[PDB]
Amino acid sequence: PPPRKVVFWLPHQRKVFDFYASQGVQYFTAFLIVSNFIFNCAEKEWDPYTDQLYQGLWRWGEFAFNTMFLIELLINFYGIAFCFWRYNWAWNTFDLVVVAIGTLTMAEAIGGNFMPPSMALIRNLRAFRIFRLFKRIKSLNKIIVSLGKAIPGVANAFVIMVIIMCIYAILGVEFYHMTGSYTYGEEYYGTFFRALYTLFQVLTGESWSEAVARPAVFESHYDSFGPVLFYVSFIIICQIVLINVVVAVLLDKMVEE
Amino acid sequence: PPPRKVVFWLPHQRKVFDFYASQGVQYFTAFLIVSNFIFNCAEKEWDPYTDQLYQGLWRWGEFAFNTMFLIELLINFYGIAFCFWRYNWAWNTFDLVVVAIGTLTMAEAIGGNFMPPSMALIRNLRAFRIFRLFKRIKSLNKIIVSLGKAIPGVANAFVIMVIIMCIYAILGVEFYHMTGSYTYGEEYYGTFFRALYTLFQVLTGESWSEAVARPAVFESHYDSFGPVLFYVSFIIICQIVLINVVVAVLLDKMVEE
Amino acid sequence: PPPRKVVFWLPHQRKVFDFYASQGVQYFTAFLIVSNFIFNCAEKEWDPYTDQLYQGLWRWGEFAFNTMFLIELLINFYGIAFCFWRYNWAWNTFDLVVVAIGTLTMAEAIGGNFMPPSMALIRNLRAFRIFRLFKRIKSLNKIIVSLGKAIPGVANAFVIMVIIMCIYAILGVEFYHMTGSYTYGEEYYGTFFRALYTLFQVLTGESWSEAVARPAVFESHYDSFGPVLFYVSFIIICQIVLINVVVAVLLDKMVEE
Amino acid sequence: PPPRKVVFWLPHQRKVFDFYASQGVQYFTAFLIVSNFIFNCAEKEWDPYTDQLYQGLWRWGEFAFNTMFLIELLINFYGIAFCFWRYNWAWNTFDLVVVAIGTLTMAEAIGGNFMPPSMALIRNLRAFRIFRLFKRIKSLNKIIVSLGKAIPGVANAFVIMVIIMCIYAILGVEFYHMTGSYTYGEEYYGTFFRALYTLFQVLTGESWSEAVARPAVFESHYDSFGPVLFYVSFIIICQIVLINVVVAVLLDKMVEE
Ligand SMILES: CC(C)CCC[C@@H](C)[C@H]1CC[C@H]2[C@@H]3CC=C4C[C@@H](O)CC[C@]4(C)[C@H]3CC[C@]12C
Ligand SMILES: CC(C)CCC[C@@H](C)[C@H]1CC[C@H]2[C@@H]3CC=C4C[C@@H](O)CC[C@]4(C)[C@H]3CC[C@]12C
Ligand SMILES: CC(C)CCC[C@@H](C)[C@H]1CC[C@H]2[C@@H]3CC=C4C[C@@H](O)CC[C@]4(C)[C@H]3CC[C@]12C
Ligand SMILES: CC(C)CCC[C@@H](C)[C@H]1CC[C@H]2[C@@H]3CC=C4C[C@@H](O)CC[C@]4(C)[C@H]3CC[C@]12C
Ligand SMILES: CC(C)CCC[C@@H](C)[C@H]1CC[C@H]2[C@@H]3CC=C4C[C@@H](O)CC[C@]4(C)[C@H]3CC[C@]12C
Ligand SMILES: CC(C)CCC[C@@H](C)[C@H]1CC[C@H]2[C@@H]3CC=C4C[C@@H](O)CC[C@]4(C)[C@H]3CC[C@]12C
Ligand SMILES: CC(C)CCC[C@@H](C)[C@H]1CC[C@H]2[C@@H]3CC=C4C[C@@H](O)CC[C@]4(C)[C@H]3CC[C@]12C
Ligand SMILES: CC(C)CCC[C@@H](C)[C@H]1CC[C@H]2[C@@H]3CC=C4C[C@@H](O)CC[C@]4(C)[C@H]3CC[C@]12C
Ligand SMILES: CC(C)CCC[C@@H](C)[C@H]1CC[C@H]2[C@@H]3CC=C4C[C@@H](O)CC[C@]4(C)[C@H]3CC[C@]12C
Ligand SMILES: CC(C)CCC[C@@H](C)[C@H]1CC[C@H]2[C@@H]3CC=C4C[C@@H](O)CC[C@]4(C)[C@H]3CC[C@]12C
């Protein structure tokens, strides 16, 4: 990409900019990204406890990785005049977000917890720094741009599927919310979200064979195969036709681009 | 679409017509459709019981939504001279159907149940008003027209698959209807529909491995691997080949259109 | 198709031939095929027992259907001079086969069982007469010719998959034939065919998670994750990559033709 | 392929070379490859024990097959001047590897075990000689070259999927490593590799529904559906979008080539 809107106020901008954007620095920063991800994985495997053994190790290790990423972000923003809205606005925004969260956790971990502790969920976004790798390795950036363009179509397919699942959830609560009168009804179709969750399980292959009772469906008279029809129609329509519609969207975009 | 057959008998027809067909009214009615669907879902989640708590709420809420949809249908039909066979015959037919069922339930819910109670299944078609949304949101109407054109070929594939499943059901009933002599035979292959249902379960991943007994298949002599051949051939031919034939039809149409 | 090799020896051949090949007779024979298939299904559902109730009904019903199909085959072969190798050789061969088996069972059922009883497996080919329907209904014949051309390429994929599955069965018998020292080893990997069958189950989604024991894989030292690698590699390669290779072949042919 | 770099030092090279490369010798060696694979399978089925019955049989049988393959490799290398780097370098390299391992096992099995016994894993590469068949049967070599070119893109898709799985593995150990306080936490999310393995099981259809406890998710207040969101998002994004991305890559290459 050509830098056209980022005019040069800074003394050495054109030099530092094309220094950072060089493929050597890109692959060195990809090295740092992958090593920091492997450091997170190593913390979670060799020391997952709440009362960590090598606690310092992980504290100072992510301290060092985060200050290196802060230095890299400063190099970048010096490169394009700290604007980051003109050139590479999306990736610069993601970089700024992750480095801000990291430096916030750093400042609080060394100099006292200023933020509430239930904010601690954000102390789990370190793992997402790895997504920046999908910008350097172009074999990965290829798949990611194909995915990012297949996303609107896929999302539309998902919304249609969600609406159909909701209709089944609405019906399931109407019909089967009293079977077993926790019964099977009261628990798997008790309310709209228990039913929506039951149908999502069934959608991904969770054996809706306990819902249908063969003695009642077959041994009884010809009026009680309603649940058979319910689950057969759901399976066919949602799982076969609509998941393959999502597939079709995915493949059409993946082979068009 | 151009209105060509709907000649103007009514005083203000050309004005009210293009008023209703304007994108603003389309998105307002999409708002009403989605809010009424969410009202159905809210009734089924926050009050699913047979002796409803906030009954009055759901009764008057669907009263109001249905009278608004009746007003909208009257606006539309005034727009095209109450014909609804010339312009947009399919969607106007669906609108008329759902609004008729709704107003029937309204009249009976406020002024006494004129219809039989076992007719009550139709009091569950409210949930399908949401399908009218697939006419306004064109990202959804796109997927729906692609599906509606892929449905002929897909239906043919399903019929071939059904015929193969029926052949297996006949064979299964003929052979394995006496295993365990409810046994496994009597119940999973007892009659043609128990066998057809067993094979539909197996088709969607329900662990046929209880049908095949390893001691009998392997420990016994080399004559008893019939059920292994049965289930392996069924799995291969129906599951792999024919469900991927359904997929192939789906993708061919989804990428052609 | 044009009849070019079937020269006319018979007195009224050109008339009877294009009488049989007319679309009216084709759809009447499709009616007879579907009704006879539904008669087989009705026998298996409403009377599956070995000591049939309405025996006489099924006996004389398939008697009548088989004599009608014998009359139809005679009409056809009179149509093309009893050659059936020149015109429509494949479908005429299938018709001759099924009608021969049917008339054999007829002659033995009315006039004594001339053949051995363990030949009785062929008395189950009635169900396959339905395949002749795939010649009349052209929406089905379309899917069937696309399948029949995708078969030589799907078969090769299946052979590659089988070869890969035979390698994993050899390795499974080599390694895991002694676990649990019926144990899990001696039963699921005991010999080459128990292992091949275990891997076919696992291939179609049968929960390999009982093979891998988490205490042994994780609690023990770093040398015992061999079965994890075995099943992860099998799943990836065979299930994902090779079943989607079969899919790819299927879709390429289904959209090319 | 034309031999252009393999100049002729040997007396009869041009004759023996095009003798070996003739289709007759290729199909005879395909016969030997398939028969030796079936000999391995027969050893594993009819004699899988550690104290083999017909031990000699298998010993001398693989002796004979390996000396025949050694003779064939010598014929080949005499054909192209023992270079095997100029002509058909990949397949000649694979042939040399497998024949070297075989002759090593032969020499040690007849004249004493020179190598360590824990090297014995290589005594299981006989099964992979069958891959050489994928060079002779061109219907198989076709599928294999299409696969070999789809492997770069597929590998990239797998790496993206692995990174997402790792991210879920890092969040799972963070959150659910204390549920049940072996518990469910301490076993299915205990460390990073238990969590990565749990998510790989779930990815291939292993019933996450035991992780999510419906009483806690629904009966409790509206704060505890975190695991529902975890597993629903994992299923959607990895199981539905990313495995179909792998499919899409596979199909694009399989239909392009
Ligand atoms: C590619 C590389 C550079 C990425 C970084 C990985 C390194 C730095 C991480 C990954 C796993 C970590 C090691 C694994 C766990 C242990 C065992 C413990 O008793 C001492 C710390 C120690 C030894 C860690 C040190 C740091 C470590 C080695
Ligand atoms: C592509 C399709 C399958 C989308 C899947 C539908 C999703 C949205 C469904 C499946 C299960 C549903 C969840 C079931 C469980 C609960 C508990 C409820 O107290 C809060 C909402 C919540 C969290 C639901 C949100 C919507 C939900 C997550
Ligand atoms: C996507 C669209 C087509 C939804 C599927 C069409 C509708 C009509 C299908 C889906 C599930 C089916 C229902 C499932 C089973 C029952 C229960 C029984 O007591 C009455 C019939 C009834 C209610 C079926 C009627 C038809 C049905 C409602
Ligand atoms: C504007 C759209 C998105 C919302 C749909 C219409 C409105 C009226 C729907 C959305 C959610 C629904 C509410 C959900 C919660 C309840 C349950 C009960 O405690 C009082 C009624 C009440 C408050 C419902 C009233 C109707 C409701 C407010
Ligand atoms: C694979 C797809 C395309 C084919 C679908 C197969 C369908 C038609 C099969 C699967 C299970 C079968 C059902 C099994 C249960 C019964 C009970 C029986 O007393 C009435 C018929 C009925 C309801 C069957 C109808 C046909 C059926 C629903
Ligand atoms: C044209 C092709 C696809 C026809 C489809 C093949 C299916 C329908 C048929 C062909 C041969 C049949 C097999 C032949 C006979 C046996 C042995 C019997 O004791 C168990 C069933 C079993 C194993 C049959 C299963 C069904 C079967 C596999
Ligand atoms: C994945 C697809 C394409 C390959 C199919 C694999 C087939 C050939 C495998 C799966 C299970 C295997 C069977 C396992 C059971 C037995 C019992 C044995 O005593 C006779 C052979 C027999 C019948 C095997 C034949 C081959 C077999 C059927
Ligand atoms: C299809 C081709 C490319 C893949 C070849 C599969 C081979 C390379 C893979 C698949 C299964 C793997 C084996 C499965 C697990 C074990 C058990 C352990 O005791 C030794 C390692 C060993 C034996 C692995 C070695 C590598 C392995 C054999
Ligand atoms: C979805 C596909 C593409 C990604 C594959 C994920 C693979 C790499 C995951 C799934 C399960 C994981 C394994 C889980 C079990 C262990 C035990 C641990 O003590 C050694 C590592 C090892 C062997 C892990 C290696 C990585 C692993 C094999
Ligand atoms: C491409 C994908 C990775 C996009 C990002 C996925 C992330 C945002 C999704 C996947 C799983 C989700 C998490 C799963 C459930 C929980 C547990 C709860 O205690 C806090 C919310 C939290 C932590 C969710 C936050 C958002 C989440 C982390």
Numbering used by the authors:
A (entry chain D), B (entry chain C), C (entry chain A), D (entry chain B): 61 to 241, 281 to 356
What does the paper say about this structure?
Voltage-gated sodium (NaV) channels are responsible for the initiation and propagation of electrical signals in nerves, muscles, cardiomyocytes, and other excitable cells. Inactivation of the NaV channel terminates sodium influx and thus determines the availability of the channel. Interestingly, we have recently described an unexpected N-terminal helix (N-helix) mediated N-type fast inactivation of NaVEh from the coccolithophore Emiliania huxleyi, which is mechanistically distinct from the IFM-motif mediated fast inactivation but similar to the ball-and-chain inactivation of potassium channels. Prolonged depolarization or repetitive depolarizing pulses over a duration of tens of seconds cause slow inactivation of NaV channel, a phenomenon that is significantly different from the fast inactivation in the context of onset and recovery rate.
Here, we demonstrate that the removal of the N-helix of NaVEh (NaVEhΔN) results in a slow-inactivated channel, and present cryo-EM structure of NaVEhΔN in a potential slow-inactivated state. The NaVEhΔN-expressing cells exhibited rapid activation in response to a train of depolarizing stimuli, the amplitude of which slowly decreased, in sharp contrast to the fast inactivation of NaVEhWT. The overall structure of NaVEhΔN is rather similar to NaVEhWT (with an RMSD of 2.47 Å), both of which are organized in a domain-swapped manner and are surrounded by lipid molecules. However, the VSDs of NaVEhΔN were rotated by ~10 degrees towards the center of the activation gate, which in turn shifts the S4-S5 linker helices and the pore-lining S6 helices. As a result, the activation gate of NaVEhΔN is almost fully-closed by the four L350 residues, which is apparently much smaller than the open gate of NaVEhWT. Strikingly, the dilated SF of NaVEhΔN was expanded by 6.7 Å between the two opposing E305 residues and by 4.8 Å between the two neighboring E305 residues in comparison to the SF of NaVEhWT. Most likely, the expanded E305 cannot form a proper HFS site for coordinating hydrated Na+.
